Amino acid sequence: STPKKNISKGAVLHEKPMTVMVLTATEPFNYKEGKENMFHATVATESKYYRVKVFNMDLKEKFTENQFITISKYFNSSGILEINETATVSEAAPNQMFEVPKNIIRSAKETLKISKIKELDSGTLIYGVFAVEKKKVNDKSITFKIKDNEDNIKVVWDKEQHNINYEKGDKLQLFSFHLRKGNGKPILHSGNHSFIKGE
């Protein structure tokens, strides 16, 4: 009876309602064959921004820029908000609304330096806008080398390569990539919810 369907392993349920303002939301996309589409979103309170993964497509209309929504029975997976059918998502009441500080909006849309990304814990989910230095396509994987002014890192995508035709010099917007660290150079690797988009 599946109230944790599509939800990450050790995600914590939050029953208390939280009002947020929607900052950004991607289009729905297929992340896994046979599964309902999902989309990525970023959302903010007065004190913080959150990355959001929503697995219920009945909610896309709720996730529009500058809309205030009240969310309850959502899951928290190491700081990432995950929303399925269990959640209640309603239009916010006027007195639940608020001003979002400029610094919160800025840091929500900000891209970390690659050198700084490598300092995060292994398993940290990575988001951001990066320039492509080069790419290698083989049959089983696409391997990007992304760079900024100071550093570079390898990005591995081993899922469907239908719309991953980006080229040298293009900027990629990455969503929910896994930072992998261990015996060797850190890499970013695609995972279940990984998504790439231009612009």
Side-chain angles (χ1 to χ4, degrees), residues 102-167:
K102 192 161 68 173
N103 60 287
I104 299 307
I105 313 264
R106 178 191 55 89
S107 70
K109 302 175 159 184
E110 207 177 70
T111 292
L112 274 173
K113 315 305 280 83
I114 286 161
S115 63
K116 286 291 189 284
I117 285 168
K118 291 180 187 172
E119 298 185 350
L120 303 171
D121 291 337
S122 190
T124 305
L125 292 181
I126 308 306
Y127 296 73
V129 179
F130 309 92
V132 177
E133 177 172 316
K134 82 228 299 179
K135 62 178 298 180
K136 171 167 61 177
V137 179
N138 70 157
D139 289 81
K140 327 139 218 139
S141 290
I142 303 90
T143 293
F144 289 104
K145 186 158 188 288
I146 62 172
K147 76 167 200 174
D148 50 35
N149 288 328
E150 288 78 22
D151 202 12
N152 57 81
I153 194 172
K154 200 180 194 188
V155 181
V156 182
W157 174 275
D158 63 3
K159 305 172 92 178
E160 174 75 62
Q161 30 186 301
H162 170 58
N163 283 322
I164 318 302
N165 29 262
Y166 313 100
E167 302 199 338

